[PDB]
Amino acid sequence: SARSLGKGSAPPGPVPEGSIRIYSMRFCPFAERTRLVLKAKGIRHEVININLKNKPEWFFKKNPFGLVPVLENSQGQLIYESAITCEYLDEAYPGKKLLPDDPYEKACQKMILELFSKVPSLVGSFIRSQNKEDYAGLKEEFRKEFTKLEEVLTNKKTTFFGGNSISMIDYLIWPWFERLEAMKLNECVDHTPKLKLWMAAMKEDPTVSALLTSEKDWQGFLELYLQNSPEACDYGL
Amino acid sequence: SARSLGKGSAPPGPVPEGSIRIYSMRFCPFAERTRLVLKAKGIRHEVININLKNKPEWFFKKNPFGLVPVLENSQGQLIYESAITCEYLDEAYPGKKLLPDDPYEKACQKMILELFSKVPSLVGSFIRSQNKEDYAGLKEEFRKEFTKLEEVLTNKKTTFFGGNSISMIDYLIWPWFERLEAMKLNECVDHTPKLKLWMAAMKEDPTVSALLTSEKDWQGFLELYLQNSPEACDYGL
Ligand SMILES: *CC(=O)Nc1ccc(Cl)c(S(=O)(=O)N(C)C)c1
Ligand SMILES: *CC(=O)Nc1ccc(Cl)c(S(=O)(=O)N(C)C)c1
């Protein structure tokens, strides 16, 4: 049932009242942001996984960019871009607010997100590699970006990037730090102690712990991904 | 007095109570967004222009990226990234809200901003050109992106990107459309009629009209810019 929908599959049909739909992919770190917010805010939702190597024709109607995550509500409104879906969920649904009310504190979280901006493309370059010589250079590129995040934690004198308690910014940058160990990149945080202590503190958060994918599951997906397999998205039953 | 501050200049000192400071550059389209918001919301402010070809040492303390626009308030809080400065100004100051209260309508504006994302880099490629052969190809690249904006106006059945009246998204994407005529790129909107009618309607907005820089002033700045002159930022006294 959690199996990804591809070419030849039928459109999902209307989203029922009282629930929101997320078009996701179980191994997508960008869609993981939305799922972390949905869980944290306890929002009632339905998941539809998209086979990103063999996309359905109807998926481009949901998002012209053809990317996960996408939200769809009962009135048929469509929201895409991982950071936009996350802000939308915090505003449109009740409970503990992940984004702070203060305009400056809100701005700060968005500034920290911009400081992290180069990390996903760097994770992408490390994955798609042809030789072991490029590895040391990319590791230094990681350190250069991870030092930007360290300076923020040092200046704020706080555990998390948004305060003493976990907030939106932590969930937005976490998926890439989650995959560092599986990719054997833990040494890239050896010069950022406050960033290293932030990771262990994050791993203990009940929301983060519940959605955390295993080392072998990421290694198994990435193996099929680097083979451009249409079974990658469906790795692990 | 409106003259840009460069190497050898002294730090500005504290921002007084009741006013906000913007670190800008009179020809910067990204900083123009912030200035359009400051004007539209009638915010009391002080402008400090930065010589971007010969930056002051103290400017990297205001923004690690060393880019304009930057906001600084009386309590010393610093806000950078043009879109972040604009959202901050709408939330922290009273009057007519440029961003709508509705979470979906807010999300939509941010989605339209993402649809425009490739235009500034395209304007940059057209400016830095070595031959007239690349011109036709880049014009087609413009049409491909300007068609994304046309589809939004067509679907919404509205004059502006955020409704029947001007909002935040219009001010955020305007500076690049402002410079199209000066760069002789008006033919790139010949296949987007609703986008072409949006430009003329924008040119009539009192906020847009008041901050509008002349054709020759942009041509004169760009000439000095493509000469990498430290007088570019100060073109036109
Ligand atoms: C949703 C998505 O883009 N998923 C995905 C899968 C695998 C990797 Cl390595 C990444 S990434 O963020 O590292 N990058 C875009 C290559 C993302
Ligand atoms: C503030 C700034 O970056 N100013 C600037 C000056 C000249 C041009 Cl052409 C641009 S652009 O947006 O076209 N691009 C970054 C080249 C921006």
Numbering used by the authors:
A (entry chain A), B (entry chain A): 5 to 241
The authors write:
The structure of the GSTO1–C1-27 complex was solved to 2.4 Å resolution with three molecules per asymmetric unit. In each case, difference electron density maps contoured at 3σ show each inhibitor covalently bound to the Sγ atom of C32 in GSTO1. The bound C1-27 interacts predominately with residues in the H-site with only three interactions with the glutathione-binding site (G-site). The backbone amide nitrogen of F34 from the G-site stabilizes the acetamide oxygen position via a hydrogen bond and the phenyl ring of F34 packs edge on with the phenyl group of C1-27. The third interaction is between the side chain of L56 (Cδ1) and the carbon atom of the acetamide group. The chloride is located in a hydrophobic pocket interacting with I131 Cδ1, V127 Cγ1 and W222 Cζ. The O2 oxygen of the sulfonamide accepts a hydrogen bond from W180. The other H-site residues (L226, F225 and P33) form van der Waals interactions with the phenyl group of C1-27. In biochemical assays, C1-27 had the highest affinity for GSTO1, which is supported by the structure in that C1-27 makes more interactions with the protein than the other two inhibitors. C1-27 potently inhibited GSTO1 enzyme activity with an IC50 value of 31 nM.
Among them, the omega GSTs (GSTO) belong to an atypical cytosolic class. GSTOs have a cysteine residue at the catalytic site in place of the characteristic tyrosine or serine. Consequently, instead of glutathione conjugation, GSTOs catalyse thioltransferase reactions similar to glutaredoxins. We determined the structures of GSTO1 bound to three inhibitors (C1-27, C1-31 and C4-10) by X-ray crystallography.
